[PDB]
Amino acid sequence: DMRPLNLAELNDCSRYPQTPNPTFAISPDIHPMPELTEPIQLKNHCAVFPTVALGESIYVYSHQIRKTPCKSEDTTHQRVSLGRIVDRGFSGPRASPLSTWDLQETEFLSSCSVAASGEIGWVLCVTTDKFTRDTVYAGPYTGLKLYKLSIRGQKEEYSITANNITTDAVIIALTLTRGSGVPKNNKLIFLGLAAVRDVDTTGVLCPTWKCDNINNNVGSCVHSYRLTADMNNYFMNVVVAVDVTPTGKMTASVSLLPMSESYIGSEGGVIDKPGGYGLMISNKGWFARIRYGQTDRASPQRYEWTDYMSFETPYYLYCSGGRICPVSCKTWNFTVPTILNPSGSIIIGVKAKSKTGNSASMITINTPDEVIDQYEVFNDYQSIGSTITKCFSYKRQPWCLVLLEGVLKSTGVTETSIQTFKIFRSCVKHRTYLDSLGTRFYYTVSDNGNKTKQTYIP
Ligand SMILES: *[C@@H]1O[C@H](CO)[C@@H](O[C@@H]2O[C@H](CO)[C@@H](O)[C@H](O)[C@H]2NC(C)=O)[C@H](O)[C@H]1NC(C)=O
Ligand SMILES: *[C@@H]1O[C@H](CO)[C@@H](O)[C@H](O)[C@H]1NC(C)=O
Ligand SMILES: [Mg+2]
């Protein structure tokens, strides 16, 4: 019933030269997945840091489990479940859980993320001897552990010590983001967050316009990567690549995303695309827009980056706005979109939500500079602290799910939940967009190199 979304097919409007532009709309109905939805706390245990991956028919879903008052040091195991996304006669898909595992060892599995390839599930975890509130910022960590899972049961476990991981930076702490990894070539590629020393600052992304009460923009930009009193500890994103050889030997590498390519280490995920992969990031910091970096064979550079000025992060729920300028305020909320075309020039995601200020969640479909469609949703939540959107083919139609963490209004209970909604694809003469007041418009491009708007009257 469920397969990966074929992005090339979804965007193939080429047989329609008179309506050649792909576009997308959000279907008005949100559908529950009750078997994948649960409170954070239940009967002396907490289930935190949810992460999900989708494969051919299967999903892989995982939470870190803690006992007692649910501090970091109370972590007891990693719960992982594998099931299928199926039609059970409802208007939206449902989960059919097949296997649940409780993964554990003497060391803590301090941070884990999941991936799926075909009907095989993978769980990659950072291991540590001690796990505290400070592990994410200062470590230490001892290595990685990789679990291979199928419907029947666990197949294999692999591990590698930190000293055997090839790295291009001085890495003091390593955490995996909640977004899934992706199988690419014979490897698994995951996004990580690392505490790093001795980094190069050349080319740090930083505006050159005037910023309030700042003469040295560059220094403010560099300083804003730091989360602790240690002046030589920068919080940055890394790409974690793991391989298992036929002999069953695990190798791993961790590659820094330099300051010239990305902002402070933030949540995100790896995106599969034809011919490569991308890194979708929901910045914690002052550059408060979604960014997407993808492999670029043509360009000698590794990653080509897209800034979605149209798609704000949750930054402004809790930090002051204004001209985009380096400041210290950060949010830990995050919203990871996914791509709807091969190049990621069209993305879809779900906004977060505060309990104040007329804050509302929205599903939004965007290009870098425009909003294609948006829909206010999740009035049943008083707040939403994180979202991860993933899309797939179900019943031969484009569908998406969102994994979110938030507080339900009716009960005040914090929950992790997964819900689904259908997408509508069409091929159009002129793609329409929404202006800041919600009026729909399109551009009547001209051959001399000009564009003018026009209002869509329904
Ligand atoms: C999203 O951000 C909010 C605001 O910073 C976080 O809520 C704060 O942090 C904890 C809640 O766990 C409390 O100590 C504070 O009182 C909260 N403030 C408010 C206004 O609620 C929230 O935890 C974040 N959620 C995620 C998933 O990042
Ligand atoms: C690192 O890898 C080498 C080569 O496989 C192996 O001999 C060595 O035991 C590993 N080190 C640790 C600490 O496991
Ligand atoms: Mg369900």
Residue numbers in the entry: 174 to 631
Q: Anything the authors wrote about it?
A:
A crystal structure of the Gamak virus attachment head domain revealed an additional domain added to the conserved 6-bladed, β-propeller fold.
Henipaviruses, a genus within the Paramyxoviridae family, include the highly virulent Nipah and Hendra viruses that cause reoccurring outbreaks of deadly disease. Recent discoveries of several new Paramyxoviridae species, including the zoonotic Langya virus, have revealed much higher antigenic diversity than currently characterized and prompted the reorganization of these viruses into the Henipavirus and Parahenipavirus genera. Here, to explore the limits of structural and antigenic variation in both genera, collectively referred to here as HNVs, we constructed an expanded, antigenically diverse panel of HNV fusion and attachment glycoproteins from 56 unique HNV strains that better reflects global HNV diversity. We expressed and purified the fusion protein ectodomains and the attachment protein head domains and characterized their biochemical, biophysical and structural properties.
